[PDB]
């Protein structure tokens, strides 16, 4: 059920893939029991998945802004010459 998302190239992950991975890993952690150190591991994974979600969802933004600007400057260079 996560074999699809886990086999994706990272650059082609969607936030839905992240949610699905989260659910499956969630179950697998659940199956190990209520050991406090299992639970500790569980919340570190939550943080990791949160980080993965943010990167998937906002990772392109800074690149995008810089790209439009690069292209605009380039347009101006061509026009002035």
């Amino acid at each position: 059920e996560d074999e699809g998302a886990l086999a994706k190239s990272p650059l082609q992950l969607t936030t839905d893939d992240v949610y699905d991975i989260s659910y499956v890993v969630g179950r697998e952690l659940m199956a190990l029991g209520s050991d406090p150190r299992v639970t500790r591991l569980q919340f570190k994974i939550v943080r990791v998945m949160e980080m993965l979600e943010t990167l998937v969802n906002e990772g392109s933004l800074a690149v995008e802004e810089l790209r439009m600007e690069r292209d605009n400057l380039k347009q101006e260079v061509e026009g002035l010459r």
Binding site: Y19, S22, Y23, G26, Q42, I45, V46, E50, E53
Partner: peptide, 10 residues
């Protein structure tokens, strides 16, 4: 209703 934390811990 769909998110990292709530999917990991229903």
């Amino acid at each position: 209703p769909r998110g990292v934390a709530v999917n990991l811990i229903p």
